Short mmCIF file of C-alpha atoms and ligand atoms in Angstrom, two decimals:
data_model
loop_
_atom_site.label_atom_id
_atom_site.label_comp_id
_atom_site.label_asym_id
_atom_site.label_seq_id
_atom_site.Cartn_x
_atom_site.Cartn_y
_atom_site.Cartn_z
CA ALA Q 1 84.35 79.33 96.61
CA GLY Q 2 87.84 80.49 95.76
CA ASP Q 3 89.95 80.67 92.61
CA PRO Q 4 89.15 77.69 90.35
CA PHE Q 5 92.49 77.83 88.53
CA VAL Q 6 95.04 77.78 91.36
CA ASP Q 7 94.94 76.35 94.90
CA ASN Q 8 95.12 77.74 98.46
CA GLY Q 9 94.05 76.70 101.95
CA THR Q 10 94.90 74.25 104.72
CA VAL Q 11 97.86 71.96 103.99
CA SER Q 12 97.18 68.22 104.25
CA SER Q 13 97.51 65.01 102.26
CA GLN Q 14 95.04 66.59 99.82
CA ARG Q 15 96.88 69.89 99.62
CA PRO Q 16 100.57 69.04 100.09
CA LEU Q 17 103.29 71.67 100.38
CA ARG Q 18 106.96 70.72 100.51
CA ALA Q 19 109.92 73.05 101.03
CA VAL Q 20 112.61 72.85 98.36
CA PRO Q 21 116.23 72.34 99.43
CA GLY Q 22 118.92 74.85 98.52
CA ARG Q 23 116.98 78.00 99.36
CA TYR Q 24 117.02 79.27 102.97
CA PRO Q 25 118.41 77.44 106.03
CA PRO Q 26 116.23 74.80 107.79
CA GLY Q 27 115.20 77.10 110.65
CA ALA Q 28 114.49 80.12 108.45
CA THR Q 29 111.18 81.95 108.58
CA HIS Q 30 109.13 83.34 105.71
CA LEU Q 31 110.08 86.81 106.95
CA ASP Q 32 113.79 85.87 106.74
CA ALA Q 33 113.26 84.79 103.13
CA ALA Q 34 111.20 87.87 102.28
CA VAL Q 35 113.65 90.35 103.81
CA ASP Q 36 116.58 88.80 101.98
CA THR Q 37 114.66 88.56 98.72
CA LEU Q 38 113.42 92.15 99.02
CA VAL Q 39 117.00 93.40 99.43
CA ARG Q 40 118.30 91.29 96.53
CA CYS Q 41 115.50 92.51 94.26
CA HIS Q 42 116.19 96.17 95.02
CA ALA Q 43 119.82 95.52 94.08
CA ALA Q 44 118.89 93.69 90.86
CA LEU Q 45 116.91 96.75 89.76
CA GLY Q 46 119.66 99.23 90.68
CA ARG Q 47 117.53 100.80 93.41
CA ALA Q 48 119.07 102.70 96.34
CA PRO Q 49 120.14 100.45 99.25
CA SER Q 50 118.67 102.95 101.72
CA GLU Q 51 115.31 102.44 100.01
CA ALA Q 52 115.70 98.66 100.27
CA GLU Q 53 116.47 99.02 103.98
CA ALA Q 54 113.39 101.19 104.43
CA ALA Q 55 111.27 98.59 102.62
CA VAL Q 56 112.57 95.88 104.97
CA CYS Q 57 111.78 97.97 108.04
CA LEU Q 58 108.29 98.58 106.73
CA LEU Q 59 107.72 94.87 106.01
CA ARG Q 60 108.85 93.83 109.50
CA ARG Q 61 106.72 96.50 111.15
CA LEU Q 62 103.51 95.67 109.31
CA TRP Q 63 103.82 91.92 108.71
CA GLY Q 64 106.47 90.64 111.13
CA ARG Q 65 103.82 89.59 113.65
CA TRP Q 66 102.49 87.02 111.18
CA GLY Q 67 105.26 86.34 108.70
CA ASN Q 68 107.89 85.04 111.10
CA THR Q 69 106.65 81.47 110.58
CA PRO Q 70 108.91 78.54 109.65
CA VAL Q 71 109.41 77.82 105.96
CA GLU Q 72 109.66 74.07 106.64
CA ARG Q 73 106.43 72.12 107.17
CA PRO Q 74 103.96 74.96 106.49
CA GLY Q 75 100.36 74.65 107.66
CA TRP Q 76 98.75 76.83 104.97
CA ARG Q 77 99.15 77.21 101.22
CA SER Q 78 98.65 80.90 100.44
CA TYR Q 79 96.97 82.43 97.36
CA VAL Q 80 99.40 85.32 97.03
CA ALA Q 81 102.30 83.38 95.44
CA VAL Q 82 102.05 80.56 92.90
CA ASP Q 83 104.24 78.28 95.03
CA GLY Q 84 101.99 78.79 98.06
CA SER Q 85 104.38 81.03 100.00
CA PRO Q 86 102.71 83.81 102.04
CA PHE Q 87 104.59 86.52 100.14
CA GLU Q 88 105.20 87.39 96.48
CA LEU Q 89 107.67 89.83 94.91
CA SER Q 90 106.75 92.19 92.09
CA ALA Q 91 108.49 94.87 90.00
CA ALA Q 92 106.67 97.53 88.00
CA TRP Q 93 108.04 99.68 85.19
CA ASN Q 94 106.13 102.84 84.34
CA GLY Q 95 107.99 104.03 81.28
CA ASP Q 96 111.68 104.75 81.80
CA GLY Q 97 113.61 104.77 85.04
CA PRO Q 98 114.07 102.54 88.11
CA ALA Q 99 111.27 100.04 88.73
CA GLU Q 100 108.99 100.02 91.76
CA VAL Q 101 109.54 96.99 94.03
CA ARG Q 102 106.43 95.59 95.66
CA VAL Q 103 105.81 92.82 98.13
CA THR Q 104 102.36 91.32 98.59
CA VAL Q 105 101.64 89.22 101.67
CA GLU Q 106 99.05 87.21 103.53
CA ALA Q 107 98.91 87.23 107.32
CA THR Q 108 98.34 83.72 108.70
CA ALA Q 109 97.35 82.70 112.24
CA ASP Q 110 99.16 80.32 114.61
CA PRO Q 111 97.98 77.73 113.79
CA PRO Q 112 96.58 78.67 110.38
CA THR Q 113 92.81 78.17 110.08
CA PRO Q 114 90.19 79.93 107.97
CA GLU Q 115 88.84 81.77 111.02
CA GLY Q 116 92.25 82.58 112.45
CA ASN Q 117 93.66 83.74 109.11
CA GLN Q 118 90.73 86.00 108.35
CA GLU Q 119 91.10 87.55 111.81
CA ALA Q 120 94.82 88.10 111.22
CA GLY Q 121 94.17 89.59 107.78
CA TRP Q 122 91.92 92.28 109.22
CA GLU Q 123 94.12 92.76 112.30
CA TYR Q 124 96.83 93.68 109.77
CA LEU Q 125 94.64 96.59 108.62
CA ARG Q 126 94.17 97.83 112.17
CA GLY Q 127 97.96 97.92 112.42
CA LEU Q 128 98.16 99.71 109.09
CA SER Q 129 95.59 102.30 110.28
CA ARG Q 130 98.30 103.53 112.69
CA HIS Q 131 100.70 104.30 109.82
CA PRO Q 132 100.53 107.97 108.72
CA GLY Q 133 101.04 107.17 105.02
CA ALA Q 134 98.08 104.79 104.86
CA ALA Q 135 94.39 105.59 104.48
CA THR Q 136 92.48 102.56 105.71
CA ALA Q 137 89.00 104.03 106.25
CA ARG Q 138 87.65 102.93 102.84
CA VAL Q 139 88.59 99.29 103.35
CA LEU Q 140 87.54 99.12 107.01
CA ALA Q 141 84.12 100.43 105.89
CA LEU Q 142 83.82 97.16 103.89
CA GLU Q 143 84.71 94.75 106.70
CA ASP Q 144 81.14 93.59 107.37
CA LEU Q 145 80.85 92.49 103.74
CA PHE Q 146 84.18 90.69 103.42
CA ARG Q 147 84.72 89.31 106.92
CA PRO Q 148 81.83 86.94 107.70
CA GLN Q 149 81.75 85.09 111.03
CA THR Q 150 82.30 81.85 109.16
CA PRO Q 151 84.79 82.28 106.34
CA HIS Q 152 85.11 79.68 103.61
CA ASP Q 153 87.97 77.18 103.76
CA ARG Q 154 89.96 78.92 101.04
CA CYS Q 155 89.57 82.45 102.40
CA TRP Q 156 92.17 85.09 101.65
CA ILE Q 157 92.93 88.79 101.89
CA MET Q 158 96.17 90.11 100.41
CA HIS Q 159 98.19 93.16 101.41
CA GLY Q 160 100.64 95.04 99.21
CA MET Q 161 103.49 97.42 100.06
CA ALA Q 162 105.19 99.33 97.26
CA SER Q 163 108.74 100.67 97.46
CA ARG Q 164 109.00 103.60 95.06
CA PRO Q 165 112.19 105.36 93.93
CA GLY Q 166 112.54 108.69 95.75
CA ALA Q 167 108.98 108.56 97.08
CA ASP Q 168 106.79 107.46 100.01
CA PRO Q 169 105.45 103.90 100.07
CA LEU Q 170 102.01 102.93 98.84
CA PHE Q 171 99.70 100.37 100.36
CA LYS Q 172 97.11 98.21 98.64
CA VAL Q 173 94.57 95.59 99.69
CA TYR Q 174 92.99 92.77 97.65
CA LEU Q 175 89.60 91.45 98.77
CA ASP Q 176 87.93 88.12 97.97
CA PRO Q 177 84.63 88.49 96.07
CA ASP Q 178 83.77 84.96 97.26
CA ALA Q 179 84.15 85.92 100.94
CA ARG Q 180 80.50 84.94 101.59
CA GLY Q 181 80.38 82.20 98.96
CA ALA Q 182 80.12 82.24 95.17
CA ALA Q 183 76.38 82.86 95.24
CA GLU Q 184 76.84 86.06 97.23
CA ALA Q 185 79.74 87.45 95.18
CA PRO Q 186 77.60 89.64 92.87
CA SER Q 187 75.75 91.14 95.84
CA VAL Q 188 78.96 91.73 97.81
CA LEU Q 189 80.61 93.48 94.87
CA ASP Q 190 77.54 95.58 94.14
CA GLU Q 191 77.31 96.78 97.73
CA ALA Q 192 81.03 97.49 98.00
CA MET Q 193 81.04 99.56 94.79
CA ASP Q 194 78.05 101.50 96.15
CA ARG Q 195 79.94 102.25 99.38
CA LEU Q 196 83.04 103.28 97.45
CA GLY Q 197 81.06 105.81 95.40
CA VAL Q 198 81.58 104.12 92.04
CA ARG Q 199 78.17 102.49 91.42
CA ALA Q 200 77.62 104.27 88.10
CA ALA Q 201 80.89 103.06 86.61
CA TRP Q 202 80.56 99.56 88.08
CA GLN Q 203 77.00 98.99 86.91
CA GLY Q 204 78.14 100.47 83.60
CA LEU Q 205 80.99 97.98 83.37
CA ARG Q 206 78.63 95.12 84.26
CA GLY Q 207 76.31 96.11 81.40
CA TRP Q 208 79.19 96.53 78.97
CA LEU Q 209 80.75 93.14 79.79
CA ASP Q 210 77.44 91.38 79.27
CA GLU Q 211 77.25 92.74 75.73
CA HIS Q 212 80.87 92.02 74.78
CA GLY Q 213 81.46 88.35 75.50
CA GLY Q 214 80.54 87.95 79.16
CA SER Q 215 81.99 89.00 82.51
CA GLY Q 216 83.72 85.72 83.43
CA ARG Q 217 84.72 85.50 87.11
CA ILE Q 218 85.49 88.48 89.35
CA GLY Q 219 88.81 87.67 90.94
CA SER Q 220 89.22 90.54 93.40
CA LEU Q 221 88.13 93.96 94.47
CA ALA Q 222 91.28 95.89 95.36
CA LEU Q 223 91.86 99.34 96.87
CA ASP Q 224 94.72 101.81 96.90
CA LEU Q 225 94.87 102.81 100.57
CA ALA Q 226 95.80 106.45 100.05
CA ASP Q 227 93.88 109.70 100.47
CA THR Q 228 95.04 111.17 97.17
CA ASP Q 229 93.55 111.77 93.73
CA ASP Q 230 95.76 108.97 92.38
CA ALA Q 231 94.08 106.31 94.53
CA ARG Q 232 91.80 103.92 92.66
CA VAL Q 233 89.29 101.15 93.18
CA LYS Q 234 90.27 98.15 91.07
CA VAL Q 235 88.26 95.16 89.89
CA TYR Q 236 89.95 92.11 88.38
CA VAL Q 237 87.97 90.27 85.72
CA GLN Q 238 89.16 86.71 85.02
CA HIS Q 239 88.36 85.98 81.36
CA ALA Q 240 87.59 82.28 81.35
CA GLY Q 241 86.59 81.12 77.85
CA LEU Q 242 87.23 84.36 75.95
CA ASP Q 243 89.51 84.69 72.92
CA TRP Q 244 92.23 87.34 72.63
CA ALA Q 245 90.38 89.66 70.25
CA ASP Q 246 87.41 89.66 72.62
CA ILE Q 247 89.51 90.45 75.71
CA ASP Q 248 90.94 93.35 73.70
CA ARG Q 249 87.51 94.62 72.68
CA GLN Q 250 86.21 94.38 76.26
CA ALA Q 251 88.85 96.91 77.33
CA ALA Q 252 87.30 99.60 75.08
CA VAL Q 253 84.99 100.60 77.94
CA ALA Q 254 88.01 102.04 79.79
CA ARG Q 255 89.78 105.35 79.20
CA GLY Q 256 93.17 104.90 77.58
CA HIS Q 257 92.16 101.90 75.47
CA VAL Q 258 94.50 101.15 72.55
CA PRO Q 259 92.78 98.81 70.07
CA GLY Q 260 94.85 95.71 69.37
CA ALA Q 261 97.47 96.20 72.09
CA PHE Q 262 96.02 93.59 74.46
CA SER Q 263 95.50 90.98 71.74
CA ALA Q 264 99.02 91.46 70.37
CA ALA Q 265 100.49 91.04 73.87
CA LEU Q 266 98.52 87.83 74.38
CA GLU Q 267 99.66 86.47 71.00
CA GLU Q 268 103.31 87.33 71.66
CA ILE Q 269 103.46 85.77 75.13
CA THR Q 270 100.61 83.34 75.82
CA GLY Q 271 100.38 82.39 72.15
CA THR Q 272 97.47 81.15 70.11
CA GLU Q 273 98.24 77.40 69.99
CA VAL Q 274 97.16 76.06 73.38
CA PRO Q 275 94.78 77.53 75.95
CA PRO Q 276 96.75 78.72 78.99
CA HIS Q 277 96.34 76.88 82.27
CA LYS Q 278 94.47 79.87 83.67
CA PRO Q 279 92.82 82.72 81.74
CA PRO Q 280 94.13 86.26 81.40
CA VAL Q 281 92.67 88.86 83.76
CA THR Q 282 91.87 92.52 83.15
CA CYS Q 283 92.10 95.01 85.99
CA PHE Q 284 89.62 97.85 85.54
CA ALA Q 285 90.39 100.96 87.60
CA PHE Q 286 87.69 103.30 88.94
CA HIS Q 287 87.63 106.73 90.53
CA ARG Q 288 84.74 108.40 92.39
CA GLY Q 289 83.08 110.96 90.12
CA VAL Q 290 84.09 109.23 86.89
CA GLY Q 291 81.33 107.28 85.14
CA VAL Q 292 83.56 104.83 83.28
CA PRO Q 293 86.70 102.90 84.20
CA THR Q 294 89.76 105.15 84.16
CA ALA Q 295 92.20 102.44 82.96
CA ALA Q 296 92.46 98.78 81.95
CA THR Q 297 95.54 96.69 82.65
CA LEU Q 298 96.00 93.20 81.22
CA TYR Q 299 97.40 90.29 83.23
CA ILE Q 300 98.99 87.84 80.82
CA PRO Q 301 99.54 84.19 81.76
CA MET Q 302 102.62 82.28 80.64
CA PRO Q 303 102.15 79.99 77.62
CA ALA Q 304 101.07 76.37 78.06
CA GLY Q 305 103.20 73.67 76.40
CA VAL Q 306 106.27 75.92 76.31
CA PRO Q 307 109.24 75.81 78.72
CA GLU Q 308 109.54 78.56 81.34
CA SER Q 309 112.82 79.65 79.73
CA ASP Q 310 110.92 80.40 76.53
CA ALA Q 311 108.13 82.12 78.49
CA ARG Q 312 110.76 84.43 80.00
CA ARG Q 313 112.34 85.04 76.59
CA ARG Q 314 108.97 86.01 75.14
CA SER Q 315 108.15 88.28 78.05
CA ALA Q 316 111.52 90.03 77.91
CA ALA Q 317 111.19 90.46 74.14
CA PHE Q 318 107.71 91.92 74.55
CA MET Q 319 109.07 94.32 77.17
CA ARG Q 320 111.87 95.49 74.88
CA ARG Q 321 109.55 95.99 71.94
CA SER Q 322 107.44 98.09 74.29
CA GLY Q 323 110.58 100.14 75.08
CA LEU Q 324 110.98 98.91 78.66
CA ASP Q 325 114.05 97.56 80.46
CA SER Q 326 114.00 93.82 79.79
CA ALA Q 327 117.44 93.32 81.34
CA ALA Q 328 116.01 94.51 84.67
CA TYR Q 329 113.09 92.07 84.40
CA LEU Q 330 115.38 89.08 83.91
CA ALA Q 331 117.65 90.21 86.75
CA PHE Q 332 114.64 90.65 89.05
CA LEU Q 333 113.37 87.13 88.28
CA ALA Q 334 116.77 85.71 89.21
CA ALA Q 335 116.93 87.70 92.45
CA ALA Q 336 113.39 86.84 93.51
CA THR Q 337 113.74 83.08 92.97
CA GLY Q 338 117.35 81.95 93.08
CA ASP Q 339 116.41 80.44 89.69
CA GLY Q 340 118.59 82.28 87.18
CA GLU Q 341 118.49 79.31 84.80
CA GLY Q 342 114.77 79.91 84.28
CA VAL Q 343 113.74 76.33 84.90
CA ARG Q 344 111.03 76.98 87.50
CA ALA Q 345 107.56 78.28 86.63
CA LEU Q 346 107.41 80.80 89.47
CA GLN Q 347 105.77 83.67 87.62
CA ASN Q 348 102.13 84.43 88.32
CA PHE Q 349 101.32 86.75 85.38
CA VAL Q 350 103.02 89.61 83.64
CA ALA Q 351 100.95 92.78 83.48
CA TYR Q 352 100.75 95.34 80.67
CA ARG Q 353 99.08 98.66 79.98
CA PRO Q 354 99.82 100.29 76.63
CA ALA Q 355 100.69 103.97 76.39
CA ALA Q 356 97.66 106.15 75.74
CA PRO Q 357 98.29 109.55 74.14
CA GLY Q 358 100.46 111.58 76.49
CA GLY Q 359 101.24 108.56 78.65
CA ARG Q 360 103.82 105.82 79.24
CA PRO Q 361 103.78 102.05 78.60
CA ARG Q 362 103.57 99.92 81.76
CA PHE Q 363 104.81 96.43 82.49
CA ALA Q 364 104.99 94.46 85.74
CA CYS Q 365 106.07 91.01 86.90
CA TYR Q 366 104.82 88.94 89.84
CA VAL Q 367 107.01 86.13 91.02
CA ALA Q 368 106.89 83.52 93.81
CA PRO Q 369 110.06 83.04 95.90
CA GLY Q 370 110.24 79.32 95.08
CA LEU Q 371 110.36 78.16 98.68
CA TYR Q 372 108.03 75.26 97.85
CA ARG Q 373 107.87 72.63 95.13
CA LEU Q 374 105.27 73.43 92.48
C1 LIG E 401 92.53 88.35 91.52
C2 LIG E 401 93.72 88.83 90.68
C3 LIG E 401 94.33 90.02 91.42
C4 LIG E 401 94.74 87.67 90.48
C5 LIG E 401 94.19 86.54 89.83
O1 LIG E 401 93.22 86.60 89.07
N1 LIG E 401 94.77 85.28 90.04
C6 LIG E 401 96.01 85.02 90.83
C7 LIG E 401 96.29 83.52 90.78
O2 LIG E 401 96.42 83.04 89.42
C8 LIG E 401 96.03 85.63 92.30
C9 LIG E 401 97.17 86.51 92.48
C10 LIG E 401 98.06 86.37 93.47
N2 LIG E 401 99.01 87.29 93.36
C11 LIG E 401 98.75 88.02 92.28
C12 LIG E 401 99.47 89.02 91.79
C13 LIG E 401 99.06 89.70 90.65
C14 LIG E 401 97.88 89.28 90.06
C15 LIG E 401 97.14 88.21 90.55
C16 LIG E 401 97.59 87.58 91.71
N3 LIG E 401 96.00 88.04 89.82
C17 LIG E 401 95.84 88.62 88.48
C1 LIG E 402 98.88 91.48 93.75
C2 LIG E 402 97.58 91.14 93.02
C3 LIG E 402 96.72 90.08 93.61
C4 LIG E 402 97.19 91.89 91.72
C5 LIG E 402 98.30 92.87 91.40
S1 LIG E 402 97.65 94.28 90.49
P1 LIG E 402 98.62 95.47 91.07
O1 LIG E 402 98.27 95.84 92.46
O2 LIG E 402 100.17 95.05 90.89
O3 LIG E 402 98.33 96.69 90.04
P2 LIG E 402 99.06 98.11 90.04
O4 LIG E 402 100.50 97.92 90.71
O5 LIG E 402 98.28 99.19 90.71
O6 LIG E 402 99.37 98.47 88.45
#
């Protein structure tokens, strides 16, 4: 159970995790690092300082109980960031204008154990249920599926908080399809999609995938925790063993598909010379009452056999050619990592959704803070 391409779980001789020098002071907590990084990233994107301050207050309120753990000698290697930190920074560009800043976190127990962490992860949602801008009913209605009495050793649940320019924050949750083991994943997903009122579209997607190259591995079921028409159910499909043209064709089931956009993005960033260390992932979005996915967003891994500096160059160039603010992307990477030189592979994926008629191109980055050696 758990992601076969990256690692997470209890730290030990078999899963080592060592803090890098030159980042935060020796007694610093993950929350200290996250608050500072969040502020720096808002500045790098030219966002309002008052909005940064609000984002910090929100982070402390919702996650401070769990995130105030020492950076040095960690007991758990999280899934949320590629360096194993329990938080990850992200920026999202939806057409022109200031980017959204997002932080995604995991709540760990003291001391961190599968049972304790899973408890903390769902305790987080009880805290969130008290926040007026959050709608947690849809995820709490899934707790008996995703929170077994005995979690697996690599259990995870991730929580996102989005800081939006001139707007209220948005909250998101990412659930582990393997919560009850790999064998139970299909059943868990099926039941969850039933409960969320999107069976038709989900079963439709399942059928479609099986006739266009195979489903792959379901990486997460995620929910927008809002009671608006904009809220979606999201399923992440990890495309192990599929070529770029096939990933592109698989997206045709979703509204807004632009033939060739996904495969061009993959060629321009991941390349066609060496398989990437982990496969690309498509996020299919769903809405109750719609019989097909409403959108498909591609998560593009960095190229294998290519330096990180070149991976950043390719990503920035792709952004520009898409019309988006590549200067802001590079600045954000520097702020999030302290690695302006671009020598550390701290990106998770970059994400892309092409502009459909009447819409805007979208790009997003996801970057670990580089508190730990890779
Ligand atoms: C399950 C997806 C959301 C996920 C994924 O397939 N793999 C990541 C590790 O390679 C997990 C992950 C952690 N933080 C993320 C931020 C954006 C996308 C991610 C992730 N994946 C595409
Ligand atoms: C944080 C993880 C695990 C996947 C990220 S997808 P996302 O929530 O950034 O997607 P959107 O921001 O809704 O486009």
